[PDB]
Design a protein around this ligand. Structure first.
Ligand SMILES: O=C(O)CNC(=O)C(=O)O
Ligand SMILES: O=C(O)CNC(=O)C(=O)O
Ligand SMILES: [Zn+2]
Ligand SMILES: [Zn+2]
Lengths: 15, 338, 338, 15
């Protein structure tokens, strides 16, 4: 639920 | 702004001067410049607030780097180099370039060898070319023996300690950035903790805290420019982005030996000073600390950003098409929440 | 609209006439009136589209019901009765009345015995009172022996078959509704399949399909009036709800013995005809069929509604406060998706 | 995910 909403990716400005 | 221009050791005069900084419509306060031994700096990192550290010796060995030394020892792997006809290098996520065909990039990626880049650099210089380049490559095993000696010479003891103290995840990569003077990486935010180590040249860094989300207007998550601002800092469209007139930033200029801590989810605008020569930087990206068991309210700004990002991600999955995210979201708020 | 007023058996004249219908700003087509034996009606239910069935004999036994008969046999349980100073009975979810304190209901619920309701009804009638009542009670075991005989007399064989054919869940309840003439239950939608059986009096039913969500403007999910339209059908605010000018409805008038199928997630407006006397109805609420294993795209309108509802539910949970749902949602779309 | 988004309550106009 809320924890899942909280969870984040690790995308950076690098292809 | 970046306070009075620092004076070089040995009476070498001002490192840089105001005329080298571009002009923007917003006000800024200066980021703190402290010693890694200063407890105040340890307080700023712990509270995920930017801070420029002046003595870490993080990349002491690389301070001798310059084009000749690198071409000579960087190895023979491929190096991503982005091209631009403008000073702005907007980032493009190629994997996401299918959801938006009505989109054409202003920066082209091109693989090439280091000596090819240096030579490409040189041609432009003589033929008076307005075209610009920006090398951005992750450092990997395919590098020279000398560069491997340098890398190993970085102050791992200090940074691995920070890694430990903050509970951060693993080091994901070290990006090497070499860009021409005047080059600008427009405002955006990354989902990782970053220790930005300046090696050669000067860079102006303007940061904005997470709670400034409403004033910066990031592109939709499924768009190739996800995590970047839609606002042209040179010509802001106040009709489309009214809240940009309320944006306040944190600014500073880093030079050889300075380490800027860019907290995860903090907006950043990076520009290599005008007529200051090329610039070289190496960043250190770490995954953030895991989400705490007990969630504390009120939620932090960065957490709300994390939520908005997931909403858009799930909605795009659920609808079967990112193009429908917008119309569903509008339908959800029109006359209901606005 | 509801087509030409049907003629009663035995030359008893028009059952009702136009002057008994309120006036609204929108156009309407007539809902189909078919026999349960007609394959076209079986096609409309299967495609979850409204249809008025004329011969089901669903509540044949209750057709003899009237106030005297019920007071006499309904038993001695308590009966919810809502009060109003207006002809509009907007529903209020009491459990949700904490998230909105700046809110005060226009309809008061009051428990009372059946004979108390009938007598309350009678007092108003003589003293010329403008005050209105609406009894809405779920039918339960605490009812008379005669009423239990009637209930058991309903055409379970036909409805349990529909239940089976459509894959619906269990019957959740049977609501008994007795209201004064002119009474209006404003537009809203329910999350269950409904077989609306008219017993006494005439009721005008105006339905709107799920895809009309954008034109009806439901209150926020956490609001007490969740699932109801914010549009005053008597005085529509086109500035706040522009799309209501594009609303098209399906209409009809049901009488003793008619069964209206109100598909789940379909908007409905119910009004007891002006000067037609009291009205009596008993509905049959069934849980919808479970979500199919393979999701088919494009998604159905009702499915998108289900999604928007969940988004608002999770967001309210995640933020720790439903009051923050609005500001987060706006921040998410302003200059980004709109 | 999407199935969860799809899932619906059974709220009716009855207190
Ligand atoms: O150095 C640059 O031009 C851009 N750098 C970044 O965006 C970063 O390190 O996160
Ligand atoms: O009968 C009424 O006045 C209102 N009925 C309903 O809203 C219903 O059956 O779903
Ligand atoms: Zn970055
Ligand atoms: Zn209803």
């Amino acid at each position: 639920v809320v924890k899942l909403l909280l969870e984040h990716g690790a995308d950076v400005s690098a292809q | 702004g970046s306070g009075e221009p620092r004076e070089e050791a040995g009476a070498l005069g001002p490192a840089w001067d105001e005329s080298q900084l571009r002009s923007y419509s917003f006000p800024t306060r200066p980021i703190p410049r402290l010693s890694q031994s200063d407890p105040r700096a340890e307080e700023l990192i712990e509270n995920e607030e930017p801070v420029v550290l002046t003595d870490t010796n993080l990349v002491y060995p690389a301070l001798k780097w310059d084009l000749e030394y690198l071409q000579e020892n960087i190895g023979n792997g491929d190096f991503s180099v982005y091209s631009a006809s403008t000073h702005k290098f907007l980032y493009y996520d190629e994997k996401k370039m299918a959801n938006f065909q009505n989109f054409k990039p202003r920066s082209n990626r091109e693989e090439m060898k280091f000596h090819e880049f240096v030579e490409k650099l040189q041609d432009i210089q003589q033929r008076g070319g307005e075209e610009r380049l920006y090398l951005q490559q992750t450092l990997n095993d395919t590098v020279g023996r000398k560069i491997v000696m340098d890398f190993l010479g970085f102050n791992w003891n200090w940074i691995n300690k920070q890694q430990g103290k903050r509970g951060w995840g693993q080091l994901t990569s070290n990006l090497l950035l070499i860009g021409m003077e005047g080059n600008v990486t427009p405002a955006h935010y990354d989902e990782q903790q970053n220790f930005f180590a300046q090696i050669k040249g000067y860079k102006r860094c303007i940061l904005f805290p997470p709670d400034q989300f409403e004033c910066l207007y990031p592109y939709p998550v499924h768009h190739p420019c996800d995590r970047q601002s839609q606002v042209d800092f040179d010509n802001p469209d106040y009709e489309r982005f009214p809240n940009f007139q309320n944006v306040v930033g944190y600014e500073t200029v880093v030079g050889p030996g300075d380490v800027l801590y860019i907290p995860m989810y903090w907006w950043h605008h990076i520009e290599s000073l005008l007529n200051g020569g090329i610039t070289i930087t190496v960043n250190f990206w770490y995954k953030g600390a895991p989400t705490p068991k007990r969630i504390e309210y009120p939620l932090k700004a960065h957490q709300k950003v994390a939520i908005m990002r997931n909403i858009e991600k799930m909605l795009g999955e659920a609808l079967g098409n990112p193009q429908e995210v917008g119309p569903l979201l509008n339908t959800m708020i029109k006359g209901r929440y606005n």
